[PDB]
Amino acid sequence: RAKIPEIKIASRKIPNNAALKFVKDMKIGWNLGNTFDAAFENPSFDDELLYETAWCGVKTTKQMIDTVKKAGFNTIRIPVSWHNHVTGSNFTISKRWLDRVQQVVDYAMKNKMYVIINIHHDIMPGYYYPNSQHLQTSIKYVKSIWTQVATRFKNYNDHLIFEAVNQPRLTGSRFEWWLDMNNPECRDAVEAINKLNQVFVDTVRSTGGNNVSRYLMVPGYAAAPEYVLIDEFKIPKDSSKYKNRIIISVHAYRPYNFALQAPNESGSVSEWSVNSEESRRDIDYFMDKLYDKFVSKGIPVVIGEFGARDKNGNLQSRVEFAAYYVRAARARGITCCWWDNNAFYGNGENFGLLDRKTLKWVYPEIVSAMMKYAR
């Protein structure tokens, strides 16, 4: 139904070290989106495990993960929102919830896949919130969640990756998605994120076993490329006797007006062309800056989320986008993970690729476009 383009992007020099070989072997990722990350108050149901299906509508199965592996993905990102699953002053995670998350991790481990688990939609005062006012509780939350999760998974091999937090930011604010680094409120949030990323690393390493050397992903503000590129971002100090085990996490649905902006919002575009510098510009730019600051210096970078939402059937554009984005990243030593939220029609964000109920690929052309350039 679509024509996959022949993409010509020269490879950059990629330092030969273990971390960048690891990221290369991850190859390309698929997010189990809108699954364990679903989060909201006042559930109509009694069984907390129904959060798994409240948004995506389909319970995860081993056959589903098998299907994702068979299509060529070698990484599964399993975002998890924990705040609807904790009780008590020290955020005890419900055993049934953590048990179910572990069952799904096991589906992926059986397929010899890389697996990323995180803290996702927990960005609220009283849980994870990056400012001085709420920092003491945020430290307690990061410490408690990651002590519990890291302990459960301590004897999992290095294919399992921990990601500190998804998109740490101030919410319901002009600064939620953009910083003015001359403003003290923004400087404070960047500092809080540095502190909480250090707490995360220290907490994980302290639990022993394979957690002493496992790869760990950390974002900057809002997981934006810009806010790991600022001078104020700090890679946490790592006590691992293995060097270079911290991976920079970024999310980049770029160009925004094509990939993520809703099609009924003024400014949205539905066309993307491999022959247009206007389509390519924003992809090249942030990847170039990340290559300059991190990859070229040997520091690994993973794009944990990208994608392009369907806009009234714009398949050819999304096919060209996906091929270009994956090749641009691979040429710079970076591996990417598509956000697959099992959403295909309606007014929502229609990022789905796999129809989970049938295990059929709705957009195999997009998958094939990525696989052509992922290795």
Ligand X SMILES: OC[C@H]1O[C@@H](O[C@H]2[C@H](O)[C@@H](O)[C@H](O[C@H]3[C@H](O)[C@@H](O)[C@H](O[C@H]4[C@H](O)[C@@H](O)[C@H](O)O[C@@H]4CO)O[C@@H]3CO)O[C@@H]2CO)[C@H](O)[C@@H](O)[C@@H]1O
Give residue 247's Cα distance to chain centre.
Answer: 12
Beta strand pairing call for 86-87 and 75-78: unpaired
Beta strand pairing call for 301-306 and 75-78: unpaired
**Closest by alpha carbon to 246, among 219, 226, 225?**
219
Measured from the CB of residue 193, what is the shortest distance to ligand X in angstroms? 15
Task: Name which of 37 and 122 has its Cβ closer to ligand X.
Answer: 37
Report residue 170 as tokens.
């101030």
Contact 257, 267 (CB under 8 A): yes
Measured from the CB of residue 250, what is the shortest distance to ligand X in angstroms? 9
What is the chain's percent helix, strand, coil content, to nearest 5?
Answer: 40, 15, 45
DSSP-based three-state secondary structure for 367: helix
Measured from the CB of residue 121, what is the shortest distance to ligand X in angstroms? 6
Measured from the CB of residue 88, what is the shortest distance to ligand X in angstroms? 26
Q: Which residues bind ligand X (CB under 6 A)?
A: 33-34, 37, 55, 121, 166-167, 177, 251, 253, 260, 305, 339, 341, 343, 348-349, 351
Task: Name which of 205 and 311 has its Cβ closer to ligand X.
Answer: 311
Measured from the CB of residue 131, what is the shortest distance to ligand X in angstroms? 19
Task: Name which of 37 and 238 has its Cβ closer to ligand X.
Answer: 37
Task: Name which of 6 and 41 has its Cβ closer to ligand X.
Answer: 41
Contact 121, 164 (CB under 8 A): no
Task: Name which of 73 and 221 has its Cβ closer to ligand X.
Answer: 221
Measured from the CB of residue 241, what is the shortest distance to ligand X in angstroms? 32
Residue whose pair of structure tokens reads 């109920």 in the numeric block = 357
Burial of 181 (C-beta count, 10 Å sphere; 0-12/13-18/19+): middle
Task: Name which of 156 and 339 has its Cβ closer to ligand X.
Answer: 339
Contact 342, 355 (CB under 8 A): yes
Task: Name which of 19 and 32 has its Cβ closer to ligand X.
Answer: 32
13-45: b (≥16 Cβ within 10 Å) or e: ebeeeebbebbbebbbbbbbbbbbbbbeeeeee
Measured from the CB of residue 55, what is the shortest distance to ligand X in angstroms? 4
Measured from the CB of residue 262, what is the shortest distance to ligand X in angstroms? 10
DSSP-based three-state secondary structure for 240: coil
Cα-Cα end-to-end distance for the chain: 24
Contact 306, 336 (CB under 8 A): yes
DSSP 242: S
Task: Name which of 55 and 175 has its Cβ closer to ligand X.
Answer: 55
**Closest by alpha carbon to 240, among 174, 153, 133, 158?**
158
Task: Name which of 156 and 258 has its Cβ closer to ligand X.
Answer: 258
DSSP 250: E
Measured from the CB of residue 305, what is the shortest distance to ligand X in angstroms? 5
Amino acid (one-letter) located at 134: H
